Design a protein around this nucleic acid. Structure first.
Lengths: 185, 201, 337, 103
RNA sequence: UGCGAAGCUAAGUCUGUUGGAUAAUGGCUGAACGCCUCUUAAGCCAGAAACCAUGCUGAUUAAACAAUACUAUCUUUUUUGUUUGCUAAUGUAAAAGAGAAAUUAUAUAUGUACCGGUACAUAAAUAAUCCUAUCACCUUUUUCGUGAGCUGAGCUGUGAGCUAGGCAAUAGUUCUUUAACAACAAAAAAGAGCACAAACUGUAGACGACUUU
RNA sequence: CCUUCGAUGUCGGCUCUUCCUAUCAUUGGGACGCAGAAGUCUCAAAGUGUCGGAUUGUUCACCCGCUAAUAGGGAACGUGA
RNA sequence: UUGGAUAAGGUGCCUAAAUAUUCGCUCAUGAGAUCCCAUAAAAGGUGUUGGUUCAUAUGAACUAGCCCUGAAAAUGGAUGGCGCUAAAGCGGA
RNA sequence: UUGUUUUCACUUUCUCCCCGCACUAAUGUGGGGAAAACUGGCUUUAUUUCUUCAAUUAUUUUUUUUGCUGAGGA
C-alpha cells in the first residue's frame, strides 16, 4: 500500500479536452463529452499543447485503487469510441420461427415477434443516440454502433434478456439472441 | 445556548449526531427550530434504513394498534422522535425540553430571514468517509409513505429564487456601504485614523 | 395450540370502527385525479334516492352463451333536483395538507341554502348572508387573481333544493364539487360563466363511462354478534344463551384484541360503491326518453301508485349501473370514477 | 445605553451528581464563552448571583437574589461547580445566573 | 287457512382499482495477475399474490386545525396601581446588545460577462467575523436627510450633525444594577344574535345522541 | 422438583381471534437424469385459503369423497364465571 | 455532617464526565458493542495486512484478525433505549 | 578454545554531463558516470543573553489565583 497511484493516458490526436470539478469536458468529432464521476476520489493533471490526461488517486488503498483502472481504460476508450464508432456483432437467433421485426419509429421502440409463436407484443429499448439496426448483408444480423463504450454496450446488453421463454431446456432448446464480437467503423 | 432561539439548517446533517446535540441543547434550556429536516442524511444504505423503518413499521400493539407506537413518517417528525428518544421525556423537565423544539420541512414563513446555523460536529462531509454509503431522510420518508417530498422541493426552489434576489440586493448594499467607508475614513482625524488602521478596522 | 379447522375471519377489519356516522350526507374522501393533457370540465354531482332497477339488454361479448339472445340486467336511474352553485373554494398544496386560501360566494344566495346554517330557523332573524353579499366586485377580482396564482384545487360549493322533493326537510344539503382539467391558465376563463345558475347534468354525464355512489347505510341500532358479524350460533344446549362468541381471546395476550367481534351498533355506516358504468342520458319533462323505438309505448321516468315511503318524483333521469345503499329519502352523493 | 452589565452570563445546569444520585451542595454552572478547563479556572474567587423574581413583594421588591461562588471547575469543557448559601431549587435548572467580576 | 305492503330478512340481486422502489437471474465496464474476468475490485440497468402508496373506514385516534356566515355595546393612546366565598388588580422553564437572510460542494465552490461549456474575479482557522453601543443638559452659529399640514417643490416637526459657552452628578465599602415581556384593575382622551328547552318528525334510537318542521 | 396443596378448575370437541414458517396450494423464479405433458429439488415470499362425512370420548388414527390445497405448529397442551 | 481525592465502572444523548488525542481493522439486503450474562458449531472463504514456506519482479500452498454463509418460532421488541460507520463498533496506546 | 585486528559500502547536494533527449509529481525524472564536501563528523581556541543548555531521576528553595474549615477558651 502506497501513496500516489496514477496513469498517464495518451490523449487521442482527434480530440480536445478540458477539466473542471471532476467533470471532464471533451470535444471529438461526433460531439462533446461529459460524465458524473463524483462517486470516486479523483484528481486530474492535464495539458493541451503537449496533451495527455492524467487521472490520479491519492493514498489509494487497493480496494478502491481499481476505480482508477476502470476509468483510466474507460475514458481512454471513450474518445476512441466517439471518434471511431464501436461496433459489436449480434445475431438474432431462432431455431424454429425466423424472427419477426417491426422496427417502428426510427430505431426507437424496437419490436420483437416470431419467437415461440406467442403472437403478442414485446419491446425492449436502448440508449438514445445509439443505433442497433438491421445489417443489409444478412437478415439474421443487427449491427450495433454508437460513440460511448457504455452507449454501444448497454444497447447490446438490455436485449439478450427481454423475450425469454419458459419450460424449455437451453441445452437442447438453443433459443437466444447472441452477441459475439466487437469491431469498429 | 445563550440565544433566544437557534435556527438549525438540517441539510447534510447526520440524524443521530444532530439529535444528540439538539437534545443536550434543549435540556440545557436553549430553544431550537430545526428547518429542512427532509435533507437530513443517515449513514448506511438507503435500503438498510428502509429495512430498519420496515422493522419499526411492523411493530404495534397486538391488542389495539391505536395504543401502539405511532410511526410519524414525516422527516421532521422522525427527527423529533429521534430527539425525544435522547431526553427524559417521561419527566416534567424532559417534557419541557421536548416542547422547546420545533421541526419543519423546508423553511416556513418566520425562517426565511433569520440566520440558519450549522453544527459541524454532525455534518456528513466531516463525519462520513466519502467512499461509504449514506441515505437521505426525505427519500426514506417518501419510500415509507410521506409522499410530500416533491412539493417541499418545489417550495424550496421558490425560496432559493427569493433568497438569490435579496442576497443580490444585499451585496450591492454592502459594497456601497464599503465604498462610503473609504472617504468616510480619510476625512476623519489622523489620530482616529491610525487607531482604526492598526486595530484592523 | 392451533385451530383444528381453519376458516376466514368474520367480517372485514377495513370498516372499523363499526360506529354511527357523524353526518347524514355521504362525504367524499377523494375526487378523481387530473392530468395536464386532459381538457377542463366538471367532476361530480349529487341527488336523493332515485331508484335502482332492471333494464332489458343484449350481450355482445365475443364468446358468451347469451350474446345475440336477450338478457336482463341491473343498473340505476338517478335523480337530479337541480343543484344550485353558490360558492367557490380554492385549495393550495402544503406539506401539512391541502389548505383553503379563500371561498367566494355568489352575489345572491337562496333561502334553502341559508336555512342550513340554523338549528331554529323559524325563530331566528334570518340574518345569515345579509352583509357579506354586497361586497364590491373589486375584492372579487383582487382575490380570484390570487386563486389561480396560488391555488391548485378548485371546488364549487353547491346545494340541493329539497323543496323540489317530497322531503319534510327544508334545509338544503351543501357540498363542494371539484373541477378537473389540464393547465391552470386554461381554467381562468372556464371558471367564470357558470358561477350562479343551477346544474344541468348533460354537460359531462355521458354514455359509456364509470361513476361511483356514496351514502350512509340504514340504521339498525345495537345488534348482537350473530347479526353484526355473522358468527356461528352456539348449540341449543348452551347455558347462558347461544347468540354470542364463545371464546373472545386466548389467555395471552391478557387482553381482548380489537379483532374480536362484539355486540354494538350495526348499520348507519359510511360506504362507497365502486365500478358503476354510466350508460344513457335523459331528462325530466321529455316524453320519449326512457323507452325505445322497439317498444314505442307512452311512459317515462314517472312512477306508479306513489313511491312507498318517498312520494312522487318530478325531476331528471339518466342511467347508471348498480344498486344503492341507504334508506328512502336518504341523500346520495354521485362521484365519477 | 443604561443598565451596564459588568458580569458574565451563566446557565444553571443540574446539581453535582452522578447517575441516579445527586449532591445538591454543589450546582453545575456553564459560563457564556468558556469551553475549556483552563479557561474555566479563570473564574474561581468570583461571586455568583442567582437573581430571580417572586410573585409578590418581600421587602417592597419583587426580586430576590441568592448568593454563592464558584469553587472549582467541573470536567474539562468549561463547566464550574458553585456553592451557594442555600441550595439552588431544581426549578431553577436552566435559568440565568450572573458570574460577577468581583472580587 | 292464505298473500302477507312496507318493515326485517338471503336461500337474490348490486359492487368489490392502479403506481414506486423492489430477491435469484442476466448483463456494461473491468481490475487484481501481461490478459481473462457480475465486483470473495470500484461505478450503471432489466425485472414478483410480498412492501409502501392509491382507494375505502374512523379521526375527543391531532386534549389538532382552516375558510366561511351572523352575533356579543366594542376597539386604540395616557395616568395611577395589582406592596356573604369574593366583587380593584400579577404572572413568567428563563432580558441585561438574548444583535446577524444567499445557496451549494466537500477530490474546491460562489459571482459577472458571453455561447451545461468558456473566460475572468471572489473564497478557503472560513462568527478566530461583522454590525451595534456611553458624546448627558441647556445656550448659540448653522448643515444634511424623513414625517404633519401645503403646492417635481417652499414651511414646521423629526433624526444625525458643526462652531462656540458654562452647567449637573456626591447619600459615607457592595448585599438584585428593583431597569424585560405579557396581563389585569380603576380613571381619562379618541374611534364602534343564537343555542338549549317545548311540540313535531323517525331517514335515528337502550338512554343520551341523531334526522327534521 | 424451582413456583403453587388457607385450591392457577386436570381430556376431547364446539366457537372465536391472532401469531410463526421449517410453504400444502396460489404468485414470480433457478435446476433436473427437463422433447411436451406430468412431476422432482430449490429460491424470494405468511397477501389469500387450507373442506364435507362413516367408526371411536378420544388427541392420534383409518377409510369414503370433494378440492387447488385439503401444510406443519404456537398462543398457561389458547379458549369450562 | 462539611470539604478533598479515588475504587469498580464509565465520559454522544438519556447520564455526571472526551463527539478527547493517537495507530490500525471492519460495511454486514438480519454488523458489532463491558466477567457472571443471558447460546452458537462442524464446514466454507484470491477483500486487508503482516505474514510463513518454497518454485524463476515472476505462481501457488498454507496461516490468522475483521466481515459473510452456515444461522428457522410463534402478542410487537429490544447492544437498556435513541442511535452510531472521518464510530458512539473491534484491538491497543 | 576467546579476545584481537584487517577487508568493502555507505552519506550531503539547487553540482554537472550524456542517453530516453522532457520520458519529471518540481524549477526534472528512469539509467551510466565525473564534482566538491556549499552537508556532515572530527581537534582546538574566549565566550553561552547571537542561539541551544533539553528529558529523566536524586537532592532543595519558592511562587500566581483560589474552595472549605475555626473544635477550644488553659
Amino acid at each position: 500500500k502506497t501513496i500516489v497511484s496514477t496513469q498517464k493516458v495518451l490523449i487521442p490526436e482527434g480530440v480536445k479536452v478540458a477539466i473542471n470539478a471532476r467533470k471532464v469536458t471533451v470535444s471529438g468529432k461526433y460531439g462533446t463529452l461529459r460524465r458524473s464521476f463524483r462517486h470516486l476520489p479523483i484528481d486530474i493533471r492535464l495539458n493541451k499543447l503537449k496533451k495527455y490526461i492524467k487521472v490520479v488517486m491519492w493514498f489509494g488503498v487497493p480496494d478502491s485503487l481499481a476505480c482508477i483502472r476502470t476509468v483510466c481504460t474507460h475514458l481512454k476508450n471513450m474518445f476512441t469510441g466517439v471518434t471511431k464508432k464501436f461496433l459489436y456483432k449480434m445475431r438474432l437467433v431462432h431455431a424454429h420461427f425466423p424472427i419477426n421485426s417491426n422496427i417502428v419509429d426510427n430505431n426507437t421502440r424496437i419490436e420483437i415477434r416470431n419467437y415461440l409463436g406467442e403472437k403478442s407484443v414485446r419491446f425492449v429499448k436502448a440508449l438514445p443516440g445509439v443505433v442497433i439496426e438491421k445489417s443489409p448483408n444478412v437478415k439474421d444480423e443487427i449491427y450495433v454502433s454508437g460513440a460511448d463504450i457504455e452507449n454501444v454496450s448497454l444497447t447490446a446488453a438490455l436485449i439478450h434478456q427481454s423475450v425469454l421463454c419458459r419450460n424449455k431446456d437451453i441445452r437442447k432448446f438453443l433459443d437466444g439472441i447472441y452477441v459475439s464480437e466487437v469491431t469498429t467503423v | 445556548m445563550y440565544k433566544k432561539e437557534y435556527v438549525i439548517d438540517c441539510k447534510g446533517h447526520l440524524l443521530g449526531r444532530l439529535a444528540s446535540l439538539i437534545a443536550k441543547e434543549l435540556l440545557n434550556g436553549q430553544r431550537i427550530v430545526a428547518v429542512r429536516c427532509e435533507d437530513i442524511n443517515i449513514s448506511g444504505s438507503l435500503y438498510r434504513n428502509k429495512l430498519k423503518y420496515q422493522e419499526f413499521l411492523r411493530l404495534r400493539t397486538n391488542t389495539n394498534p391505536k395504543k401502539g407506537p405511532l410511526h410519524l413518517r414525516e422527516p421532521s417528525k422522525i427527527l423529533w422522535r429521534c430527539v425525544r428518544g435522547m431526553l427524559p421525556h417521561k419527566t416534567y423537565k424532559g417534557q419541557l425540553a421536548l416542547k422547546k423544539l420545533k421541526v419543519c420541512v423546508g423553511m416556513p414563513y418566520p425562517y426565511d430571514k433569520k440566520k440558519k446555523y450549522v453544527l459541524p460536529s454532525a455534518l456528513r462531509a466531516f463525519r462520513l468517509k466519502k467512499h461509504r454509503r449514506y441515505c437521505r431522510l426525505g427519500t426514506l420518508s417518501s419510500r415509507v409513505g410521506w409522499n410530500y417530498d416533491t412539493l417541499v422541493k418545489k417550495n424550496e426552489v421558490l425560496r432559493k429564487q427569493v433568497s438569490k434576489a435579496y442576497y443580490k440586493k444585499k451585496v450591492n448594499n454592502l459594497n456601497e456601504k464599503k465604498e462610503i467607508k473609504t472617504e468616510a475614513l480619510n476625512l476623519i482625524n489622523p489620530e482616529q485614523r491610525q487607531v482604526l488602521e492598526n486595530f484592523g478596522y | 395450540s392451533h385451530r383444528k379447522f381453519e376458516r376466514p375471519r368474520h367480517g372485514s377489519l377495513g370498516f372499523l370502527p363499526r360506529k354511527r356516522c357523524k353526518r347524514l350526507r355521504g362525504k367524499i374522501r377523494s375526487f378523481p385525479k387530473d392530468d395536464k393533457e386532459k381538457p377542463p370540465h366538471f367532476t361530480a354531482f349529487m341527488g336523493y334516492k332515485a331508484g335502482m332497477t332492471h333494464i332489458v339488454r343484449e350481450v355482445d361479448k365475443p364468446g358468451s352463451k347469451l350474446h345475440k339472445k336477450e338478457i336482463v340486467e341491473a343498473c340505476t336511474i338517478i335523480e337530479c333536483a337541480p343543484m344550485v352553485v353558490v360558492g367557490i373554494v380554492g385549495y393550495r398544496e402544503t406539506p401539512k395538507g391541502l389548505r383553503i386560501l379563500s371561498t367566494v360566494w355568489a352575489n345572491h344566495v337562496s333561502d334553502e341554502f341559508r336555512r342550513r346554517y340554523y338549528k331554529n330557523w323559524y325563530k331566528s332573524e334570518k340574518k345569515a348572508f345579509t352583509k357579506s353579499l354586497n361586497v364590491p366586485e373589486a375584492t372579487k377580482n383582487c382575490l380570484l387573481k390570487r386563486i389561480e396564482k396560488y391555488c391548485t384545487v378548485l371546488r364549487a360549493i353547491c346545494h340541493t333544493q329539497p323543496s323540489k322533493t317530497p322531503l319534510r326537510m327544508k334545509k338544503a344539503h351543501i357540498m363542494e364539487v371539484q373541477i378537473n382539467g389540464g393547465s391552470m391558465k386554461e381554467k381562468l376563463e372556464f371558471v367564470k360563466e357558470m358561477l350562479e345558475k343551477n346544474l344541468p347534468v348533460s354537460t359531462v354525464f355521458n354514455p359509456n363511462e364509470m361513476i361511483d355512489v356514496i351514502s350512509v347505510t340504514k340504521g339498525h341500532g345495537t345488534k348482537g354478534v350473530v347479526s353484526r358479524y355473522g358468527v356461528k350460533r352456539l348449540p341449543r344446549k348452551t347455558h347462558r344463551g347461544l347468540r354470542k362468541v364463545a371464546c373472545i381471546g386466548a389467555w395471552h395476550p391478557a387482553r381482548v384484541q380489537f379483532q374480536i367481534p362484539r355486540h354494538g351498533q350495526k348499520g348507519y355506516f359510511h360506504r362507497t360503491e365502486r365500478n358503476k358504468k354510466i350508460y344513457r342520458i335523459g331528462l325530466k319533462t321529455d316524453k320519449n326518453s326512457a323507452s325505445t323505438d322497439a317498444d314505442i309505448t307512452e311512459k317515462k321516468i314517472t312512477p306508479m301508485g306513489g313511491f312507498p315511503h318517498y312520494g312522487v318524483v318530478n325531476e331528471d333521469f339518466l342511467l347508471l349501473k348498480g344498486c344503492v345503499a341507504g334508506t328512502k329519502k336518504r341523500p346520495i352523493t354521485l362521484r365519477k370514477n | 445605553l443604561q443598565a451596564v452589565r459588568l458580569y458574565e452570563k451563566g446557565v444553571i445546569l443540574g446539581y453535582k451528581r452522578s447517575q441516579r444520585n445527586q449532591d445538591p451542595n454543589f450546582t453545575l454552572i456553564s459560563i457564556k464563552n468558556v469551553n475549556t478547563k483552563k479557561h474555566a479556572q479563570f473564574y474561581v474567587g468570583k461571586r455568583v448571583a442567582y437573581v430571580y423574581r417572586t410573585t409578590k413583594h418581600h421587602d417592597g421588591v419583587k426580586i430576590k437574589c441568592i448568593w454563592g461562588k464558584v469553587c472549582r471547575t467541573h470536567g474539562n469543557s468549561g463547566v464550574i461547580r458553585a456553592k451557594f448559601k442555600t441550595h439552588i431549587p431544581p426549578k431553577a435548572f436552566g435559568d440565568r445566573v450572573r458570574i460577577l467580576m468581583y472580587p
